Each structure stands twice: as C-alpha cells, then as structure tokens.
Structure 1
Amino acid sequence: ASKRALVILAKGAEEMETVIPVDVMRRAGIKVTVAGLAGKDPVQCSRDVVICPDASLEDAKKEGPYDVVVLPGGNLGAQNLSESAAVKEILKEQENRKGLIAAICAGPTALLAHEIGFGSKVTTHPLAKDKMMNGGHYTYSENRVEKDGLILTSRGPGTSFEFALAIVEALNGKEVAAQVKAPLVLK
C-alpha cells in the first residue's frame, strides 16, 4: 500500500515550497493530496502563482489518516495555517497517532501556534527564528533539514529538495529517495 501525504495549501503559501515537495513525493510513488485550507477554489500563492487544489481540507481530512502532513511556508500562508482550527485538529491527531509532520520555512511557526512537538529540535527560515523561539519551546538548529523523530523541519525555498527527499526517505526508505534524487540533477 502506498503511503499517503496531506499538503495543506493556504493563501500566501510559498509556491516553490509547495510544488517541490508535491512533485518529489509523487515521483516517490506517494499518494499526495493537495488540500485547500479555504475550500476547493484556486489558491493565490505568495508570488502570485495560482494552484488548484485537489480537494478542500474539509473533504481531505475525512480521507485520513495520512503518513505525513506537510506545511509549506510563506509568511502569510503560515499565518493562515496558524490561525486555523481545522489545522490545529489535524496536527494534534497526527501527533497523537505518532505520524510524521513536515514543515518548511515559516511553516514551523504553525507548530508553535498549535502547540505541536514542544521540546523538539527545529529549524526555520532565518527570518522566522524569533517567532518560532518565542517562549523557548523548541531548540533551534541551523541544519538545512532537521529531523527530531516525527517532527521534520527545513529552512527555505533552497532547501525544498532536501526537505522533500527527507520526507521520501522517512516514508519509503533510503533506496527510493536515492532513486528519485538521481534524475533531478541536484548538487
């Protein structure tokens, strides 16, 4: 059975941080659902790329559980994620069931908002560090990708491939990740 990923797409999401993980997980044979936070309508990303989600979050959440929940960054996207009761509920359930949560750039600040994974070692975009660290609930890392158990974080558009391949490795193993990586022409 293929593994399953939920990507939560909100207005203001960073489009590279959304599309790179979706594409790479699909290359890995993961069944990815791109879910619109606000509904099934098209989502205007931070740099004005318009993406049509596969489903509303309302619907996608009924189709769980997922092997990973993925939170893209973008300052405004992450704020929308942080404000969402539905996201809170999804992340709490994912944490409760010992499932992976992956967040990139400003995305990890939604973990803080929802009180998820406290005590974890995390990274964020440099400009999001002070927000993530408010209260000292996490330990900060400058690694490009940080994985502390079931909390996987990364720093920015330029770490998106590394982030996505870490999700692939966690779900499908090192060999699948290496196989997916080669045709990408990385490094």
Structure 2
Amino acid sequence: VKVCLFVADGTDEIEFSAPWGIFKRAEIPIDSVYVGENKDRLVKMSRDVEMYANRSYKEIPSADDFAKQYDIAIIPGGGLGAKTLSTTPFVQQVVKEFYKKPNKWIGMICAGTLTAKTSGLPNKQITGHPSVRGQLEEGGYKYLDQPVVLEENLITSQGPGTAMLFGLKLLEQVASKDKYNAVYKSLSMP
C-alpha cells in the first residue's frame, strides 16, 4: 500500500501531521506531494510552519500515472490549502479515478472535504468543518455531525480535533486488525 498526502501552501499542520504520523507508524509508505509554485518544494503551511514536501505533483505526468503509484489519496484542510487543492484538476482527476475503485481510498478533512463537491463525487453523505457545512449541503450532500464519515471508499472528517480519528479510519481500511490495533494502542487515544 502506498499513500499520497497532498499538501499546498496554506495546508493545516495538524491535519497533515496526524495521517502522516499514523501511516509512518504503520510502516506504510507515504509521500507528501506538493501542489504549488515553490520550486524547492518548500511549503508555507496554514499556521506558518515551513516544511519540505517529498515531491511536487509536477513529477507525476497524469492521474492514470498517479494511480499506478499510489493507493490512497489524502486531502487535508486549512482554508488556503484546501482552496488550492480542491481547485486543481490533477487532484480532482485522482479523486474521480479512485472513487469506488477496489483497493483505492480517498480521505478529505476540514475544508478539504470541499474536494468531494468540486470533483463531482456522487456520495450521498459527507462531513467537513462546520464552517463548510452549508457549502457541503449546498452540493446536495447530507451532512453528518460526527467526527468521521465513510461512504464507499471516501473518508471525510471535520477538523483539527478529528485528524487522529481520520487517519485511523484510513488506516483501518488497509491494515490487518492486528496491525491496526498495535498502531492504535501506541497512540494513547483518549
């Protein structure tokens, strides 16, 4: 299994770090893939952390090529980061390709959940940050006020406070119960 954590200028640090750290603990390969202008892959996160992404998306020639490399695509939030990711055709194309495929998985958290709406995903239910609830429900989704929603192979989640639950939900789809439980235990979930 092979994970892509998308990242842009303006991506939220908390929502990035939780899935990152969970998949690393699981010993599941994960790359950060930057969508932006910086030629050095230096990202200015939402709350001003400056981080190097592993890759630029420009390295990947198409969505079909992306699908040959990765099994899980994760779209974190933060207002600016989500605006950029959600309005990038490459990201949308990956999400559309992955949706309802066997052994592919999509995660979106906070304002990142707007990517379901822009890509035209036909899931019925969704969650996202309360600040984007109206926008989601505008798009015909039925909003669920719970930390995480799974429909088909799309995981959505609300905010920085639910980033750990979100990462875990993703991991749960792809890890054995044995591995899941071991990672879970190591986290000290409250």
Q: How high is the TM-score relative to the length of structure 1?
A: 0.91
Check if 1:95 corresponds to 2:93. no
Paired position in structure 2 for 1:154: 157
1:4-83 pair list within 5 angstroms: 4-38=2-36, 40-60=40-60, 62=65, 64-83=68-87
Deviations 1:61-107 (A, max 9, x none): 64534221000011111110122111122112212634211001111
Paired position in structure 2 for 1:182: 185
Distance 2:49 2:116 in 1: 25
Paired position in structure 1 for 2:138: 134
* Structure 1 counterpart of 2:187, one-letter code: L
Check if 1:105 corresponds to 2:102. no
Name the SS of the counterpart of 2:156 in structure 1: strand
Deviations 1:116-161 (A, max 9, x none): 2x2332111111111112231x221111111112110111111111
Give the percent of matched residue pairs that are identical in Structure 1 and Structure 2: 28
Between Structure 1 and Structure 2, how many residues are aligned? Answer: 183
Deviations 1:9-41 (A, max 9, x none): 011111110011111111112110100012652
Q: Is the 1:104–1:153 Cα contact (8 Å) retained in structure 2?
A: yes
Distance 1:53 1:32 in 2: 11
Runs of 4+ in 1 over 6 A off after TM superposition: none
Are the structure 2 counterparts of residues 173 and 84 from structure 1 closer, same or farther at C-alpha, using a change threshold of 3 Å?
Answer: same
Name the SS of the counterpart of 2:99 in structure 1: helix
* Structure 1 counterpart of 2:111, one-letter code: A
Are the structure 2 counterparts of residues 96 and 16 from structure 1 closer, same or farther at C-alpha, using a change threshold of 3 Å?
Answer: same
Are the structure 2 counterparts of residues 43 and 165 from structure 1 closer, same or farther at C-alpha, using a change threshold of 3 Å?
Answer: same
Name the SS of the counterpart of 1:133 in structure 2: helix
RMSD after superposition = 1.6
